[PDB]
Amino acid sequence: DAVLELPAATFDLPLSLSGGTQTTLRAHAGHWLVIYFYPKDSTPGSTTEGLDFNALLPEFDKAGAKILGVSRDSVKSHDNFSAKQGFAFPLVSDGDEALCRAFDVIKEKNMYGKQVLGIERSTFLLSPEGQVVQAWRKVKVAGHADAVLAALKAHAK
Predict the structure, then answer these.
(1) CA-CA distance, 69 to 93, in Å (whole number)?
(2) Domain containing 74: what range?
């Protein structure tokens, strides 16, 4: 079953991708989709996470699954990040945090004497039918991509 219910409109949100094209979650119907959210392009943790998923791409292909990385950085930033690291999967430029809010990854914390909001590293597995069947929040990068792959294989049966 679904572990998270997304607003219906979420599936038709135009998602800006590195490379200049757009996609939508509905467009990915028919196959598994891994959506991993990270705070910022080109940082140590997010570079490690991106490279980890990239190295496992063939394994995800074996399952027919697709991967999408997401942050609120610009398409230009994503293009530079992807080109420098050699990513072979798209990065979503969720500049207005529409997708982030849908998955509720924008968390609030009392810090610096006020309320500070930010993207919490999180990952989700979307089934071929468009259901969010597994979620990982407050993600620890080390070994994460390996865990997501294992879970995907378990779900795909």
Answers:
(1) 9
(2) 1-157
Tokens of 8: 């219906």
**Helix or strand or coil: residue 39?**
coil
Give Cα 6 distance to the centre of its chain: 15
Q: List Cβ neighbours of 147 (8 Å cut-off, separation of 6 or more).
A: 136
Q: Are 144 and 49 in contact (CB under 8 A)?
A: yes
Spatial separation of the C-alpha atoms in residues 72 and 21, rounded to whole Å = 16
* Number of structural domains the chain divides into: 1
This entry's atomic model was obtained through: X-ray
The CATH number assigned to the domain holding 69 equals: 3.40.30.10
* Residue 104, CA distances (Å) to 1, 53, 56, 65, 138 in order: 19, 22, 27, 23, 12
* DSSP code for 76: H
Q: Whose CA is closest to 99, among 125, 72, 128, 133?
A: 72
